[PDB]
Design a protein around this ligand. Structure first.
Ligand SMILES: *C[C@H]1C[C@@H](C(=O)O)C[C@@H](O)[C@@H]1O
Ligand SMILES: *C[C@H]1C[C@@H](C(=O)O)C[C@@H](O)[C@@H]1O
Lengths: 252, 252
């Protein structure tokens, strides 16, 4: 295992780390959300950049990143543009997606970026190497909002992310049955037992999958997402309730 | 599904029911424990009769049952002699085991008895029919403190309990790996999806199995055990923490 340490938070040891997602449509709402979020308790702040409407302007995006960093100078900050293709709010070109992520890297304002695996291998690898050259970590990600692949497919997908240089592979899948939730846990455990080179983040979405957001410590998900007021994906529970459960499991 | 209702508690619907176990070595300690336990919040009281030292006297056992019922007139009360063979505190003959359970049935003091499947089919069936003739329900049980059978074996074991007339089949197994915890959840889900005639109670014991004590609602365990001060089996957590988690999952 190679853990990832950002600002004295160690990802891949101990209790799963709690991530919350800031969603602001405009600069004023980003400000208001940042000031509210700093009164919540969590480990990592994700900025969901795809919720921001003025996406075409790299400088508008950077101004908003600074509002967030100014509000929370000491928080681990993860910059995430989630494509509509993978369940996010809007669509941009691949070149603009890469430009935004590289601008985030260059700014020094963010600790981590999210890179979607299915952007394409060559672009992903080049952007991972750019991030690493500038001391930014990569959460490499994949989301299936329709269905759950087999455990074997999910393991191979997470292993491919590792091979492309991901610091933290991540997969979120949609259960169509309770059995699909167990499939996601099975894949998570296989990574823990047999492919334990990088911390991985896994989740089964929606109501049936909520147990997967709670059981990260035993089966090997390094982080989990909670909701401050609105979920950033189906199945997230209130962040304080998430924290309560994680502590009970850590101390059991 | 045929649910089991005891004193306005419905087992096999809604949130898993919380069971705690009263362990007293003698009549004075049974008294003290009953008075403490009635200041805890839970759904079913199990009296672990095998912890009681004066086991040879049916009348001493009945006196202790009455102390408990007097302290808690409205609680669902489950009478359980757990054999040392199945992880309990002492050994008695099969005939004395049956005598104690029948005396409990006859007393009107208890709502449910525990009957261990591996006592033997004919004795178990006869005692189930005696319980049913006297309006007492049967939790039919099996415990493996060493290892976890396959999911297929556990399903067939729980189905056999159903066939012998169990109102609530129950299995507790010891994981030797994290994979074994998933095996127990898999068997539980198979009962929910394909053999949903009776409520079943399932648990993977010890620290690795604790998630199985929390995830009953999603995968189909009808009840779960918590600890008031001391666990009655490995892996039980503090009852208030158990209750907190169950409510979070019920409301997620
Ligand atoms: C990494 C994904 C995970 C989503 C989830 O399923 O909780 C939340 C979303 O904001 C993140 O980008
Ligand atoms: C039915 C068993 C279950 C045990 C457990 O694993 O929690 C506790 C014990 O007192 C019960 O009789």
């Amino acid at each position: 295992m190679k853990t990832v340490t950002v600002k004295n938070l160690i990802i891949g040891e101990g209790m799963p780390k709690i991530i919350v997602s800031l969603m602001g449509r405009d600069i004023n709402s980003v400000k208001a959300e940042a000031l509210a979020y700093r009164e919540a308790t969590f480990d990592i702040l994700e900025w969901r950049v795809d919720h921001f409407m003025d996406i075409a302007s790299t400088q508008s995006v950077l101004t908003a990143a600074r509002v967030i960093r100014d509000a929370m100078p000491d928080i681990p900050l993860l910059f995430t543009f989630r494509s509509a293709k993978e369940g996010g709010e809007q669509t941009i070109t691949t070149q603009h997606y890469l430009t935004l992520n590289r601008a985030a890297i260059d700014s020094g304002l963010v600790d981590m970026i999210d890179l979607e695996l299915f952007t394409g291998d060559a672009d992903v690898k080049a952007t991972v190497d750019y991030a690493h050259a500038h001391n930014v970590y990569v959460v490499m990600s994949n989301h299936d909002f329709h269905q759950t692949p087999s455990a074997e497919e999910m393991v191979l997908r997470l292993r491919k992310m590792q091979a492309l240089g991901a610091d933290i592979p991540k997969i979120a899948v949609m259960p169509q049955s309770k059995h699909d939730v167990l499939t996601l846990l099975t894949a998570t455990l296989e990574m823990q037992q047999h492919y334990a080179d990088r911390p991985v983040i896994t989740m089964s979405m929606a109501k049936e999958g909520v147990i997967s957001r709670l059981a990260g410590e035993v089966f090997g998900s390094a982080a989990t997402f909670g909701a401050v007021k609105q979920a950033s994906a189906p199945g997230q529970i209130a962040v304080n309730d998430l924290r309560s459960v994680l502590m009970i499991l850590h101390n059991a």
